Design a protein around this nucleic acid. Structure first.
Ligand SMILES: [Mg+2]
Ligand SMILES: [Mg+2]
Ligand SMILES: [Mg+2]
Ligand SMILES: [Mg+2]
Ligand SMILES: [Mg+2]
Ligand SMILES: [Mg+2]
Ligand SMILES: [Mg+2]
Ligand SMILES: [Mg+2]
Ligand SMILES: [Mg+2]
Ligand SMILES: [Mg+2]
Ligand SMILES: [Mg+2]
Ligand SMILES: [Mg+2]
Ligand SMILES: [Mg+2]
Ligand SMILES: [Mg+2]
Ligand SMILES: [Mg+2]
Ligand SMILES: [Mg+2]
Ligand SMILES: [Mg+2]
Ligand SMILES: [Mg+2]
Ligand SMILES: [Mg+2]
Ligand SMILES: [Mg+2]
Ligand SMILES: [Mg+2]
Ligand SMILES: [Mg+2]
Ligand SMILES: [Mg+2]
Ligand SMILES: [Mg+2]
Lengths: 185, 257, 168
RNA sequence: CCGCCCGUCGCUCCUACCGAUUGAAAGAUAUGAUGAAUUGUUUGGACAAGAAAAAUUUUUUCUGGAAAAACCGUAAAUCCUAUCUUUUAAAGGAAGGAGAAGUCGUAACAAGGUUUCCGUAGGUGAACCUGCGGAAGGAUCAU
RNA sequence: AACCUGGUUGAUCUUGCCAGUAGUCAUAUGCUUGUCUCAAAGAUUAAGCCAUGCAAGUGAAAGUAUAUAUAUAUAUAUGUAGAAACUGCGAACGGCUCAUUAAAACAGUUAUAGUCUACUUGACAUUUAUAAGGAUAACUACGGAAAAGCUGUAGCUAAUACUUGCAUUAUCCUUGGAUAAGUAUUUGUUAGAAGGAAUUAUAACAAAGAAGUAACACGUAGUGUGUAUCAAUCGAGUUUCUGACCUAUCAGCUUUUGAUGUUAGGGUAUUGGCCUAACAUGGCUAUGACGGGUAACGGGGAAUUAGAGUUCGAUUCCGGAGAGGGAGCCUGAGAAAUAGCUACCACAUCUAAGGAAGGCAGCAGGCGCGUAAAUUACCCAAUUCUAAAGAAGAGAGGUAGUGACAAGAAAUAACAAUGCAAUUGUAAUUGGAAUGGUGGGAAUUUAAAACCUUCCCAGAGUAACAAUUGGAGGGCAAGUCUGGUGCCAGCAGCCGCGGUAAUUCCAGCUCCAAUAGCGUAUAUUAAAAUUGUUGCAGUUAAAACGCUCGUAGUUGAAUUUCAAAGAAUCAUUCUUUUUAAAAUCCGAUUUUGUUACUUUGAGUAAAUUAGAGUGUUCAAAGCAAACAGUUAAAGCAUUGUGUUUGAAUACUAUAGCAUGGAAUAACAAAAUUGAACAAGCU
RNA sequence: AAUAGAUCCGUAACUUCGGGAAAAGGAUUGGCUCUGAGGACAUUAAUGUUAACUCAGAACUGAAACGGACAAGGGGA
């Protein structure tokens, strides 16, 4: 028979392929956060739309209802744990005010750039892809990793990286080799 | 041909067995015996999935070959024998005793009773028959015939049965004040007392049960099991004592570190 | 062979059905037993769960009762005289459930030489005129094609008057 | 207005229609005729075990029992008729659409040079003309 | 995201369609392709035809071994193993496909007081005995046939195969006789703890009567095999109510030959026109019968949608049906079975020509058909099933091979210095670091097969380790740049371009869009308030019947108990109190028509869906997991022992079961008459 | 030459709606033994007497024959 494992999509197309303002705004965001395609913007938009839909549905529902209490507390806890709400705006009405730059600020790339530790956002993306970064004793190499609140104080270089106290790379060792046979003969 | 079916597919097995939806296309397909398929659990599931003693089916087999597992005081070697509600289990090698019960969800658990409690169980009466010579026989939920039943026993109350000898010790009536456990939909491990009985003529009888937190629920008559008099129960209960909280306060409790 | 399904009948509206199933062998209809007056003949046929029933092919005696007293006696069957379904079965002398037969009455008259508490029953005359010639009229009450036997009871009362008027 | 535009007729191309030929083909259903195989009951009786004094057997048998027949049933299949559904040939006849600089007239648009139009009925190469009753969507909101 | 643009004109405002736009667990095809994870795949057309190999077997205490082999103790005894064969059980489960089928099948909800039921579980029995019978396999000798899973004759011998058949008690009133001397089942006469309801359990009297209660095996006081009834369990056959697409150029069907009922029987496991005889004239229909069509198997579900809706569902699970087309049948607890048998129609195999054998819509594979679809591979290690039930077997199932169907992540650089228009930026030049892709060897994984993860060695500069597919007049982002052609060649979904100035053809350069992906064709959803219940139009744009009557349908005035007075909250929201009557506890509780409709419950399979928890390195996912410790503390049981967990909840017609009810609607009760009560009178 | 009596089924084109029509076509038929249906009258629903001729079914039977001789349409485009 067919396998019982399933799958789902994560993005969507804009329905209007040549609108000028949307295109300029997307280029703004891509150049600001150093991304690859329009697909990344579209996937973040998809996620935000799901969140907002849940919030709207709960807000229509009766005050001090059981379903409202349970699901609203769960959603607010998730949002505050992700690092998107804060402390004085956990009210299920500040969820509807969340914008795209809010979510797109939590990527490991932006965090690695902002925490010193890298000269540029493109440099940040290159370092993540070359196994130089850890998030709490686990080495991570995916720039779309979204950092949670209790994990943003453990970002650091990896112990197996030349930038974090290990042997140097394939270029240093070859230069040192060649220099050794030059200086011993 | 179109005869009796012999196989069971995994996604069609009863959901309270909690079988992985990967790793296989089949389920153990319990045998015929004292309990129905849907109100029971095979011995392989108990002894591999729950207690984690075996890692495969073949290890359950090599456990049961050496005759050390007794249900209701008799050794069994059938890997798909049905094990049912009030049944006591003894593993001689480890010197352990269990009784299956429902938790507040619909899933069976082994309760880990002691040795003195391991000498009896409770059976509920399903019907009473009159046979040749005007002798009475009782039929229990356990698929069991009891001859020479007491004249004051009716077709819905419960009795307490000795296991070394199949004789009756005492019986408990089915009244307004009796203590009950419920065994079907929407409320499967709930314990309450009883509030009222309805007795609709051609259709089902509805009865109401009041919890120890003054919560009220109702169900059919045919899924009610009397387990004590007004004061106290006659068996030990799992940790929760049949007290079902709702999701909000259950979640609140689970977050107490 | 013979089937007992209703897939080949017309609907109550008069329309006809389209068949998309073969015969299923759990609606058999095996042929009838036309039991006849003669020396004993019984065959065997098995049902579903290997339950046997006994086909009679020829019988000439059985167990007969006298309902007024509650006594049963073995006796011999002489002839069939009336069938209420059709008279083609009195035609060939076939035994079915509701037949009328004539039987030997000597065992019943002999047994009456003990006169259990019905000592004041005042046997009606028509039965006495029947007893004088040695033969009486009875009605079969078993199903010979299923049990392999033929039992009955003595006819009396308005029962007798009805069946006597029907036969003249 | 040196505007626009209508219909026959002649040429080419494509689509569909009527059509003698008791036209042709493939399936479906019903009635009839003949009917393989086989359940049941009856008939039959190669022979296998039986009761007889005799010496291994003479005709007597309660039994068991193969081939083979008959009858009532369950009924594949073949054929002959009768309708029905689908596809399809054709002398000849007669429409529509498209194309090309064709021939004849000028019916409509202005009071289009006889105001236009409706129903009906006649007639004429063609557009159309004429009788009878109606409308204004008229060229008159008025004596 | 509850959205609109180009095209009728000299120009304008409308109706109205044509074209543009986005998605498809939706198919085919063109160009292109570096890494990893996940995994659909001969349905559409031909339920067309098939070479070859495989797909169901089974003995670890316990039926029958002088085929034989072997071990000890001592010609003897106890053992162990065991090709054949008889016996027992299973092959009716599994796997495949969607031809038929339109009140049929199926789904929710009922009944069996109208039935059958192997294996498994619990109860538990009645009318020569120190051990009975005969006969048959395997085996031996003599054979036949071209050929086949063919078999003749003669001679032995076993069984849990096939048969026959022995030895004890309970009641009537510390005596005694009578007797019960009969399990299921059939007939006649009676009596009578449970269910809403009995011709119910059950008991008695008089006749029939199956089948049985161990002439079996092991050595663990125990088991194994077999056995009459009852009950349970795994199941099935029938059965109640409600629920489907298009068609009236289908209006009357059914009934001589069962159509609708009654009576009596037959038959079946049981009810029944299921069948047979006699009788009667019924049954369905404009609320669509009877017919026709479907490129129709039905559900759980899928796609797209603000809310309504529209369109799909051959295909993981459940139900139905079939094995080239029809019909018939044996065994068996279970079959109208097809890797069972018997015939006919079609197709086809071997042959010595006399004869004998056949059924891939099971797994691979071939031909044909077509726009349209993979290996004649490995394994029983996991999930399960069968058996004489650890130990054997399984194209069920798992693993790999092919595979841009579909889904998820993610490379093709980054940095510094110097120059250079504006702190930038980079058409540049220099120079050192960082990395996979790739080759080799290991630790692992796995039935010492290959992926993946992790280490060691080698290894980037034109980082040649070199990204594509469509476009550039408008709709619609992007060139009044060069050369060629000249109403030709060609382009263009639509409006349009093409005669020397072509922003549109053919090329070069440059720009634009999406990007390991991007175009084209057909079908379908939104756009479409262009099918309109929500929600369209009908003077002149398409469209009020010539006019009136009239049945079915749809829709219908007002009226019957309206109030009034306190408490709880920062006028509001809630909540108490009784005011007409009759029946009912020695100046008192509780009852007062039927539906619709609305509230709340019960019962329900998962997968899919919504949704709670949990860092697969993230995500798609999955249903798991978390905690202390270079090897002990700590806890709880007296030396012993790890601990805490999760796998929720909702949803499941419109019909059915129960339940609170004051408003809105319908019905019942209402006169050329109808009651209720005192009192005498049966 | 072939057909033809009677009973039971089934009948097209066309049409002046009256026909065509016995359209075309299919089945049956003896003898013997039985079963069922159809009236009148007088003692009172119950008993008793009493006819005539047709029609419908069943079993059995024979060298598969039966309007057995006589009598008696050929059909269609
Ligand atoms: Mg079948
Ligand atoms: Mg196993
Ligand atoms: Mg004029
Ligand atoms: Mg397939
Ligand atoms: Mg198909
Ligand atoms: Mg199957
Ligand atoms: Mg009849
Ligand atoms: Mg389907
Ligand atoms: Mg299926
Ligand atoms: Mg085939
Ligand atoms: Mg078959
Ligand atoms: Mg065949
Ligand atoms: Mg096959
Ligand atoms: Mg195949
Ligand atoms: Mg393909
Ligand atoms: Mg296994
Ligand atoms: Mg064994
Ligand atoms: Mg160009
Ligand atoms: Mg549409
Ligand atoms: Mg619409
Ligand atoms: Mg809309
Ligand atoms: Mg419109
Ligand atoms: Mg009008
Ligand atoms: Mg004629």
């Amino acid at each position: 028979p067919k396998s019982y494992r399933n799958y789902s999509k994560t993005a969507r197309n804009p329905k209007r392929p040549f609108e000028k303002e949307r295109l300029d705004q997307e280029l703004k965001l891509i150049g600001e956060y150093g991304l690859k395609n329009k697909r990344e913007i579209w996937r973040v938009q998809y996620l935000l739309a799901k969140i907002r839909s849940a919030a709207r549905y709960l807000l229509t529902l009766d005050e001090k209802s059981s379903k409202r209490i349970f699901q609203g507390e769960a959603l607010l806890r998730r949002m505050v744990r992700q690092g998107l709400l804060g402390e004085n705006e956990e009210k299920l009405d500040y969820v509807l005010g969340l914008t795209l730059p809010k979510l797109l600020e939590r990527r490991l790339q932006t965090k690695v750039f902002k925490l010193g530790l890298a000269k540029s956002v493109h440099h940040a993306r290159v370092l993540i892809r070359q196994r130089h970064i850890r998030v709490g004793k686990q080495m991570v190499d995916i720039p779309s990793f979204l950092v949670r609140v209790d994990s943003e104080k453990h970002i650091d270089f990896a112990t197996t990286s030349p930038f974090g106290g290990a042997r140097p790379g394939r270029v240093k060792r070859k230069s040192l080799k060649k220099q050794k046979e030059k200086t011993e003969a | 041909g179109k005869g009796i079916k012999k196989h069971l597919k995994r996604v069609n097995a009863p959901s309270h067995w909690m079988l992985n939806k990967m790793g296989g296309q089949y389920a153990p397909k319990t045998s015929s015996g004292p309990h129905k398929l849907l109100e029971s659990i095979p011995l392989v599931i108990l002894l591999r999935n729950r207690l984690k003693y075996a890692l495969t089916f073949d290890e359950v087999k090599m456990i049961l070959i050496q005759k050390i597992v007794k249900v209701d005081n008799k050794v069994r070697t059938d890997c798909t024998f049905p094990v049912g509600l009030m049944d006591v289990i003894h593993i001689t090698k480890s010197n352990e005793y269990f009784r299956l019960l429902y938790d507040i969800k619909g899933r069976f658990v082994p309760h880990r009773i002691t040795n003195e409690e391991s000498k009896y169980k409770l059976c509920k009466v399903k019907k009473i028959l009159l046979r040749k010579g005007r002798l009475s026989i009782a039929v229990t939920h356990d698929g069991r015939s009891i001859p020479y039943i007491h004249p004051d026993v009716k077709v819905n109350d419960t009795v307490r049965l000795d296991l070394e000898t199949g004789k009756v010790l005492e019986h408990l009536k089915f009244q307004v004040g009796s203590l009950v456990m419920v065994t079907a939909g929407h409320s499967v491990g709930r314990v309450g007392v009883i509030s009222s009985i309805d007795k609709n003529m051609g259709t089902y009888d509805i009865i109401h049960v009041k919890d120890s937190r003054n919560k009220v629920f109702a169900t059919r008559l045919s899924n009610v099991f009397v387990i004590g008099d007004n004061t106290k129960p006659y068996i030990s209960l799992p940790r929760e004592k049949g007290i079902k909280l709702d999701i909000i306060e259950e979640r609140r409790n689970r977050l107490k570190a | 062979g013979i089937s007992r399904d209703g897939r080949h009948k017309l609907r109550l509206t008069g329309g006809k059905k389209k068949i998309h199933k073969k015969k299923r062998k759990y609606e058999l209809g095996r042929p009838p037993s036309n039991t006849k007056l003669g020396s004993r003949q019984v065959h065997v046929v098995r049902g579903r769960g290997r339950n046997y029933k006994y086909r009679a092919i020829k019988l000439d005696s059985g167990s007969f009762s006298w309902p007024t007293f509650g006594i049963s006696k073995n006796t011999r069957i002489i002839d069939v005289v009336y069938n209420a379904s059709n008279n083609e079965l009195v035609r060939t002398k076939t035994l079915v459930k509701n037949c009328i037969v004539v039987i030997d009455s000597h065992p019943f008259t002999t047994w009456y030489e003990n006169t259990k508490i019905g000592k004041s029953k005042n046997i009606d005359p028509l039965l006495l005129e029947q007893f004088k010639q040695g033969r009486v009229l009875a009605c079969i009450s078993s199903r010979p094609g299923q049990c392999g036997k033929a039992d009955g009871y003595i006819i009396e009362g308005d029962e007798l008057l009805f069946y006597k008027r029907k036969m003249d």
